[PDB]
Amino acid sequence: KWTYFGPDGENSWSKKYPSCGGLLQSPIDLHSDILQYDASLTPLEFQGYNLSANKQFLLTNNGHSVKLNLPSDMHIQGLQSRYSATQLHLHWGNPNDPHGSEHTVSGQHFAAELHIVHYNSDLYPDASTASNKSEGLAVLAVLIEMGSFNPSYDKIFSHLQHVKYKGQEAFVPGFNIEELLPERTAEYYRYRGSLTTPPCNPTVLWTVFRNPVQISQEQLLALETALYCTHMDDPSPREMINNFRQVQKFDERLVYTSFS
Amino acid sequence: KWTYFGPDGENSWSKKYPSCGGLLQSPIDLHSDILQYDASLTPLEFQGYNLSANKQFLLTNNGHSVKLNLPSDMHIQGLQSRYSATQLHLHWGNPNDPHGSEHTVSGQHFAAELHIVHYNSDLYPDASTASNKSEGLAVLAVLIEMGSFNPSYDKIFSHLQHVKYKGQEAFVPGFNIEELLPERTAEYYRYRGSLTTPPCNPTVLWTVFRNPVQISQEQLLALETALYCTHMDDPSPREMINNFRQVQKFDERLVYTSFS
Ligand SMILES: CCOc1c(F)c(S(N)(=O)=O)c(F)c(NC2CCCCCCC2)c1S(=O)(=O)CCCO
Ligand SMILES: CCOc1c(F)c(S(N)(=O)=O)c(F)c(NC2CCCCCCC2)c1S(=O)(=O)CCCO
Ligand SMILES: [Zn+2]
Ligand SMILES: [Zn+2]
């Protein structure tokens, strides 16, 4: 029903998902003219991020990205409610243009981006219910650049061959999800925005960490080449590349920083 | 019917103008991964650009930009067909974020952008007929940076406070339009794209000059602050700001450069 390329791509999302042409759209370019330091922003705390190795967590190719289900005990503290892991997923580019982050910083794309999606567990019973309601969701964005091999991201990437096609699922043993975050999480950008995919609901509080993490060139190539958007038995298989939205207009509004 | 902000803004253009969701859309980010030097790209020649000082040309606020009508006397030589001028216009941002070029270079916006629109007069009678047809249009793009005052651009900008509202018109004495082009016009980016506004027809051969021109801070602020999208009698005026399209995806394709 929607894609990132061709007729059903992002310029046409608004047809069946009005909100994709509505208010508070994400992602955005983070640049000096729209930033303002807010001394009252607090470091987040990641409570229940260290998942038991004796437990397993479902990895799914949903046709648009790869997601890992996360438990609702996993949560935070630092916003104006409690916000609870639902899943994480990634966005990336392609081997010819390996620059597929969603947010940009001073016009620069990063190689990829990790999103850790939570929901307002104080106001709503689950993520789906929260998704189209006030204050529903909160997403952590980690920018990814090419560099040294990252064993923590390999805890995900080493399973990708078991979820090659849409609808395929496989389990991942628990590991410490905090290992996927950067240094100095205390420094971040924060703004009110949207889901970056249909239905584009304007109900997410974004936190984009200032500092990127690194993965190796080999890990990045593996991610860009592992997956397909189509199901087994689809007559036209389509490789899963360039699964990021273009940056949106951001006018008469501010991104707040926890760093001066 | 269309705008750059709100429900009729660019994520919605495809709902009224199907080509805005189609192939070959402009503008784009000009960055190394999608560039290829093409030594066969020769300098264009700008013929008839020295408009008679004894003639006047119509400047109109069309509710989307300010446009100057140009005569068919003006020709680009050097392409497979001769293209003849029809009009020029500009795109810009706003005083709080004065970075409103359409094309970007290595992720960076410039302050504004000038487009000189031409049509394939060897094949088509006029620009309207050419606009939806094979090899119909060629646009020259000049990137504009804030810095030094530009006397040549002021031959247009000195009239802005007299075309403040939609439908208003002024006359501009003829001058040498080539004075609006940057240094080393032999150096450019070339690609096949589209109109950057509705109807978004994928019929444009783009030439984006490598080097920007400069206009002063005062000139840029005049451009950003003088004009409204609404009629003079309108009780609720809308400022003409941020009249640029976001960059489009550009995958499995190349921009050719005449410089290395
Ligand atoms: C390709 C990745 O898709 C995203 C996604 F981009 C974002 S983002 N970038 O964080 O805005 C997502 F949040 C999600 N999942 C959300 C889960 C919580 C609520 C249920 C509705 C889906 C949104 C998902 S998704 O669940 O993977 C697909 C949702 C289609 O509606
Ligand atoms: C805001 C400026 O609008 C552009 C414009 F952005 C471009 S661009 N960026 O060069 O693609 C245009 F080419 C034009 N005008 C063209 C004139 C020649 C063909 C007739 C159809 C309109 C396109 C015009 S426009 O004529 O000013 C308005 C066109 C509405 O269809
Ligand atoms: Zn995401
Ligand atoms: Zn234009």
Residue numbers in the entry:
A (entry chain B), B (entry chain A): 4 to 263
Quote the passages of the study that discuss this structure, keeping the authors' original sentences.
Four ligands in complexes with CAXII are of similar structures, contain a cyclooctylamine group at the 3-position and (3-hydroxypropyl)­sulfonyl tail at the 4-position, but vary in substituents at the 5-position: compound 9 has a (4-hydroxybutyl)­amino moiety, compound 10 - piperidinyl, compound 13 - methoxy, and compound 14 - ethoxy. The introduction of methoxy (compound 13) and ethoxy (compound 14) groups at the 5-position of fluorinated benzenesulfonamide 5c resulted in the most strongly binding compounds for CAIX, with the K d,obs reaching 4.5 pM at pH 7.0. The elongation of the 5-substituent from methoxy to ethoxy decreased binding to CAVB by 12.8-fold and to CAXIII by 6.8-fold, whereas other anhydrases showed up to 2-fold change in affinity. Interestingly, cancer-related CAXII also interacts strongly with 13 and 14, exhibiting 0.05 nM and 0.11 nM binding affinities, respectively. Complexes of CAXII-13 and CAXII-14 each have four subunits in both duplicate structures, and the ligands adopt nearly identical conformations across all eight subunits. First, the meta cyclooctylamino group is positioned in a hydrophobic region of the active site, making the main contacts with A129-S130 (main chain), V119, S133, and side chains of L197 and L139. The meta-ethoxy group in compound 14 is oriented similarly within the hydrophilic region of the active site, but unlike compound 13, there is no space for a water molecule between the ligand and protein side chains. The hydroxyl tail is oriented against the backbone of P200–P201, forming a hydrogen bond with the main chain oxygen of P200 in most subunits. Interestingly, despite the bulkiness of synthesized di-meta-substituted compounds 10, 13, and 14, especially the first one compound 10, which possesses large piperidinyl and cyclooctylamino groups, ligands acquire quite similar binding poses in the soaked and cocrystallized complexes with CAXII.
The role of carbonic anhydrase isozyme IX (CAIX) in tumor cell survival, proliferation, migration, pH regulation, and cell-signaling pathways made this enzyme a promising therapeutic target in oncology. , Tumor cells primarily express two membrane-associated carbonic anhydrases, CAIX and CAXII. These isozymes belong to a family of zinc metalloenzymes that catalyze the reversible hydration of CO2 to form HCO3 – and H+. Although the active site is characterized by conserved amino acids between 12 isozymes, the amino acids further away from the zinc ion provide some variability. Crystal structures of CAIX and CAXII with five compounds by using soaking or cocrystallization were determined to confirm the binding mode of the ligands and reveal insights that govern enhanced affinity.
